[PDB]
Amino acid sequence: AKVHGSLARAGKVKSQTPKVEKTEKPKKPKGRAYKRLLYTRRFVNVTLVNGKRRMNPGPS
Amino acid sequence: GKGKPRGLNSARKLRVHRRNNRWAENNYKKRLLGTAFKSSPFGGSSHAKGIVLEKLGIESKQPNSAIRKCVRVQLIKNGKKVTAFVPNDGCLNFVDENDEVLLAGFGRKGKAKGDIPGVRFKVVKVSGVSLLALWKEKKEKPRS
Amino acid sequence: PRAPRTYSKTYSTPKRPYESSRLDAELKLAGEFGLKNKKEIYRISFQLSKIRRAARDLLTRDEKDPKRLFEGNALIRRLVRVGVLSEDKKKLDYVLALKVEDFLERRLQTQVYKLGLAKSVHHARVLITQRHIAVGKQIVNIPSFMVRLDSEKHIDFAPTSPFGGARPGRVARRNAARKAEASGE
Amino acid sequence: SVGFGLVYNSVAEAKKFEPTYRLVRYGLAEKVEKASRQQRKQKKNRDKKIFGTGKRLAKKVARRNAD
RNA sequence: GGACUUUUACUUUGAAAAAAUUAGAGUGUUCAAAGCAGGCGUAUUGCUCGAAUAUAUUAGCAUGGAAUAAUAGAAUAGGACG
RNA sequence: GGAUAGUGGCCUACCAUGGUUUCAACGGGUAACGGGGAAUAAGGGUUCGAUUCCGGAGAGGGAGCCUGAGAAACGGCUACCACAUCCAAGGAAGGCAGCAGGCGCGCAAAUUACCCAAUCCUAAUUCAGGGAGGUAGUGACAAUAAAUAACGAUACAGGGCCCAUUCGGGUCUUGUAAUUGGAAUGAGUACAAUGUAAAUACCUUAACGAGGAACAAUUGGAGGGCAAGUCUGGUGCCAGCAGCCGCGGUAAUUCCAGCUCCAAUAGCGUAUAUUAAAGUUGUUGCAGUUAAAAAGCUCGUAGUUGAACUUUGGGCCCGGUUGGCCG
Ligand SMILES: [Mg+2]
Ligand SMILES: [Mg+2]
Ligand SMILES: [Mg+2]
Ligand SMILES: [Mg+2]
Ligand SMILES: [Mg+2]
Ligand SMILES: [Mg+2]
Ligand SMILES: [Mg+2]
Ligand SMILES: [Mg+2]
Ligand SMILES: [Mg+2]
Ligand SMILES: [Mg+2]
Ligand SMILES: [Mg+2]
Ligand SMILES: [Mg+2]
Ligand SMILES: [Mg+2]
Ligand SMILES: [Mg+2]
Ligand SMILES: [Mg+2]
Ligand SMILES: [Mg+2]
Ligand SMILES: [Mg+2]
Ligand SMILES: [Mg+2]
Ligand SMILES: [Mg+2]
Ligand SMILES: [Mg+2]
Ligand SMILES: [Mg+2]
Ligand SMILES: [Mg+2]
Ligand SMILES: [Mg+2]
Ligand SMILES: [Mg+2]
Ligand SMILES: [Mg+2]
Ligand SMILES: [Mg+2]
Ligand SMILES: [Mg+2]
């Protein structure tokens, strides 16, 4: 069907969303030590057990 | 025993029959006839480079409503005109008419992607510096 | 126009993509043996797979088949020599069994821990990879060396390095430079 | 460290049984170092396009300086 | 050495069988991919294991099998023997 | 007969009328050199091989030939066709599908470097020559190993546990730390020798070389399939996402982002193909009443197929390999 519609609005949403810049953070380990932080975090010390186990909850 | 011959000599009838009924096997057909080279905008190659003609905004299909930004591209090696899509938000701003772009397929063996009727190819590299890099802000568009 | 320096890869790769059970199991194995790549687990799983296969193959043969006997007991003595196959269960029937942890538990960075010298599989990793420890005076820096059995009796520290006496190093003696330049002349 | 070594019965029996790059490395025969490979090649290829001793053509191309 | 022999299919076993690849043995290239090395003593005059095995299917060959499948024979006896 | 090195319709005279074919001749296509092989792992299969080894064919296209033991050779010649260079306009010369290297073409591919030291070759030949071949440069082609951190003290919190009448923090540490602790090491830098034809790097090794401004990991994903949020801000059927099902028209679990998190990790994504999935090519092993699919019917040639029956049974000997209970 129509092929010649408007084009002006091209790149609208990105170009109008407030550029909020990142926040400086602790350098996470790069490699085995990361797999270790993952091991202890996932399993060793454990976290919540509210029914089951949540891997990324916000205001839960 | 319905159908196929079972004798110890029927080898011929069997392999022949296999050829025959292989011809209904789509993929086989296309691979054999060589639709690959005769038809198809690209040579059979993964991608192909062409030149930008019109900048078209195609109204998407149903049940959907939008304006899919695209580019009329005439393949260099081919001269075949073919209309492709410029992915990501923005990007149509990056391309401009009379430009030299690298085109790739839309992963479906031909067949237009989603709500975009006709368009069977997406864009990858304007003026030789990759859409993504620009749309982020790594590289910057070449001089001319 | 020369000769083709041949090669082959060492790791297979799991056919299912995102299975939490397997992924967690893998993770635990990594976090326990001090691994960085799931590839370190894959590699082993593949070794295990080719062995197990050779086993099945030789079993389908006839009992006391020449090939079965020769090759079978060759694989077997190969497997016991590095402390993987149980000297008790020792007629391929158990290599059909076996598992990954058998191989895992026999690596250099594992042995370096299972007998002191570590208190941490990670301490094992770091130390080993840092030119410490050896077999003879032959330094080794491969976290997966796989300690051969009757050489377990040679995993000390290095004739180089501290912990085995040779020189404190460069950081320590830089502190000695700090002392010999501070508290006096 | 691990390498290889040999010992020749006289001093004359090494200077004629050894690669003279080894004699070079030791301190026996100095390297008569020369024009590059491409250079020498090029010189032979020039020299090919001349039949005879040369002086005849140097002087016949010296007669060429006249007319 | 002389004299004649119904033709097959299948199967068995062997010969003829480039290397690399492959499968697989051996040797701790620091490990691994690899490489085909190496190992030892009297390390001032020298001792020594190696560098396998497998596959190589159709056809040609050579050998054993005689089930399963065909083929040929003696009725206008122009049969079989001696 | 002729010709060849030689057999032969190889060629020529005369004579005959034969030769292949549905068991697929002949013709057409091949984005076709053949093989050893390669990719995919239940098996059977499917797919691919221009490319390090073997065999063949060419040296821009055709033919022609000299020399020679060997060539219908092309870094040999001759002619023609197509290219194309030099000129003083009379004339003369070139053949990179050798090594580099240049244009072109493209999605797509590296230095106009060093050497005979090795592996081997040729000559008259121990030496000379060898862009064969080797060295380095270029090089996330594919492949192997695998740094980006290890360990204390300590500020409360704790779960363990002896006791609990009721102070609890004690010594077994799970560790979350917004204070600290001395330790270690190659990534790089760089004497030395080693390496090498010479150099380069590697293995070795003096003097250097880690505290968050690093010597600072990436590439995608977080509705589903599918592993990880129903957090906050933006947009409002717009911009965009989405392989597929689907999301966006003001509280978007999908878009633009921030935070957090997942998967893989010096690698991850995308496009094209192909294999597995695929018992959706079905010999193994598909389906066909109504979903795709039994010719309206019977004859019948090739083809595949085709009942049963002919030395069955009894008796004796020899000599091998495992295994039993003795050793
Ligand atoms: Mg049809
Ligand atoms: Mg739909
Ligand atoms: Mg064209
Ligand atoms: Mg050191
Ligand atoms: Mg071709
Ligand atoms: Mg082919
Ligand atoms: Mg080939
Ligand atoms: Mg080609
Ligand atoms: Mg020629
Ligand atoms: Mg040439
Ligand atoms: Mg030639
Ligand atoms: Mg003139
Ligand atoms: Mg060239
Ligand atoms: Mg490339
Ligand atoms: Mg020479
Ligand atoms: Mg480089
Ligand atoms: Mg870094
Ligand atoms: Mg990210
Ligand atoms: Mg989920
Ligand atoms: Mg929101
Ligand atoms: Mg988001
Ligand atoms: Mg079906
Ligand atoms: Mg129907
Ligand atoms: Mg019917
Ligand atoms: Mg009919
Ligand atoms: Mg029958
Ligand atoms: Mg009998």
Swiss-Prot record, chain A:
Residue numbers of Phosphoserine PTMs: 15
Pfam families xref list: Ribosomal_S30 (PF04758)
Region (Disordered): 1-34
Keyword set includes Cytoplasm: yes
Modified positions (Phosphothreonine) in chain numbering: 47
Any one GO molecular function term: structural constituent of ribosome
Localization of this protein: Cytoplasm
GO cellular component, one term: cytoplasmic stress granule
GO biological process, one term: cytoplasmic translation
Record text on subunit structure and interactions: Component of the small ribosomal subunit (SSU). Mature yeast ribosomes consist of a small (40S) and a large (60S) subunit. The 40S small subunit contains 1 molecule of ribosomal RNA (18S rRNA) and 33 different proteins (encoded by 57 genes). The large 60S subunit contains 3 rRNA molecules (25S, 5.8S and 5S rRNA) and 46 different proteins (encoded by 81 genes).
Protein family per UniProt: Belongs to the eukaryotic ribosomal protein eS30 family.
The protein's name: Small ribosomal subunit protein eS30A
Organism encoding this protein: Saccharomyces cerevisiae (strain ATCC 204508 / S288c)
Protein's gene: RPS30A
Swiss-Prot record, chain B:
Superkingdom in the source lineage: Eukaryota
Linked residues for Glycyl lysine isopeptide (Lys-Gly) (interchain with G-Cter in ubiquitin): 55
Compartments where located: Cytoplasm
GO molecular function, one term: structural constituent of ribosome
Keyword Secreted among record annotations: no
A Gene Ontology biological process term: translation
InterPro entries tied to this protein: NA-bd_OB-fold, Ribosomal_uS12, Ribosomal_uS12_euk/arc
CDD domains attached to this UniProt entry: Ribosomal_S23
Keywords assigned: Cytoplasm, Hydroxylation, Isopeptide bond, Ribonucleoprotein, Ribosomal protein, Ubl conjugation
Residues bearing PTM 3,4-dihydroxyproline: 63
PTM per Swiss-Prot/TrEMBL: Hydroxylation at Pro-63 affects translation termination efficiency. The stereochemistry of the 3,4-dihydroxyproline has not yet been determined.
One GO cellular component term: cytosolic small ribosomal subunit
Quaternary data: Component of the small ribosomal subunit (SSU). Mature yeast ribosomes consist of a small (40S) and a large (60S) subunit. The 40S small subunit contains 1 molecule of ribosomal RNA (18S rRNA) and 33 different proteins (encoded by 57 genes). The large 60S subunit contains 3 rRNA molecules (25S, 5.8S and 5S rRNA) and 46 different proteins (encoded by 81 genes).
NCBIfam families to which the protein is assigned, alphabetical: PRK04211.1, uS12_E_A
Family under the similarity heading: Belongs to the universal ribosomal protein uS12 family.
Note from the entry: Present with 10600 molecules/cell in log phase SD medium.
Protein name from the UniProt record: Small ribosomal subunit protein uS12A
From Swiss-Prot, chain C:
CDD domains: S4
Keywords: Cytoplasm, Isopeptide bond, Nucleus, Phosphoprotein, Ribonucleoprotein, Ribosomal protein, Ribosome biogenesis, RNA-binding, rRNA processing, rRNA-binding, Ubl conjugation
Modified residues (Phosphoserine): 183
Residue intervals of the S4 RNA-binding domain: 106-180
Residue location of crosslink Glycyl lysine isopeptide (Lys-Gly) (interchain with G-Cter in ubiquitin): 179
InterPro entries: Ribosomal_uS4, Ribosomal_uS4_CS, Ribosomal_uS4_euk/arc, Ribosomal_uS4_N, S4_RNA-bd, S4_RNA-bd_sf
Any Pfam family: S4
Entry GO MF terms: rRNA binding; structural constituent of ribosome
Presence of keyword Ribosomal protein: yes
GO cellular component: 90S preribosome; cytoplasm; cytosol; cytosolic small ribosomal subunit; nucleolus; nucleoplasm; small-subunit processome
Region (Disordered): 159-185
A single BP term in Gene Ontology: translation
Other known facts: Present with 106000 molecules/cell in log phase SD medium. There are 2 genes for uS4 in yeast.
Family statement drawn from the similarity comment of this UniProt entry: Belongs to the universal ribosomal protein uS4 family.
Subunit structure comment from the entry: Component of the small ribosomal subunit (SSU). Mature yeast ribosomes consist of a small (40S) and a large (60S) subunit. The 40S small subunit contains 1 molecule of ribosomal RNA (18S rRNA) and 33 different proteins (encoded by 57 genes). The large 60S subunit contains 3 rRNA molecules (25S, 5.8S and 5S rRNA) and 46 different proteins (encoded by 81 genes). Interacts with snoRNA U3. uS11 interacts with MPP10. Component of the ribosomal small subunit (SSU) processome composed of at least 40 protein subunits and snoRNA U3.
Protein name according to UniProt: Small ribosomal subunit protein uS4A
Gene name tied to this protein: RPS9A
Swiss-Prot record, chain D:
Primary localisation category: cytoplasm
Ranges of compositional bias, category Basic residues: 37-47, 56-67
GO cellular component: cytosol; cytosolic small ribosomal subunit; mitochondrion
Region (Disordered): 34-67
Keyword Metal-binding: no
Subcellular location: Cytoplasm
Modification after translation, per record: N-terminally acetylated by acetyltransferase NatA. Also partially acetylated by NatC.
GO molecular function, one term: structural constituent of ribosome
Keyword Mitochondrion: no
Top-level taxonomic group: Eukaryota
UniProt entry keywords in alphabetical sequence: Acetylation, Cytoplasm, Isopeptide bond, Phosphoprotein, Ribonucleoprotein, Ribosomal protein, Ubl conjugation
GO biological process: cytoplasmic translation; maturation of SSU-rRNA from tricistronic rRNA transcript (SSU-rRNA, 5.8S rRNA, LSU-rRNA)
Remaining remarks: There are 2 genes for eS24 in yeast.
Family recorded in the similarity comment: Belongs to the eukaryotic ribosomal protein eS24 family.
Subunit annotation: Component of the small ribosomal subunit (SSU). Mature yeast ribosomes consist of a small (40S) and a large (60S) subunit. The 40S small subunit contains 1 molecule of ribosomal RNA (18S rRNA) and 33 different proteins (encoded by 57 genes). The large 60S subunit contains 3 rRNA molecules (25S, 5.8S and 5S rRNA) and 46 different proteins (encoded by 81 genes).
Stated name of the protein: Small ribosomal subunit protein eS24A
Protein species of origin: Saccharomyces cerevisiae (strain ATCC 204508 / S288c)
Gene: RPS24A
Parent-protein residues present: 69 to 135 of 135
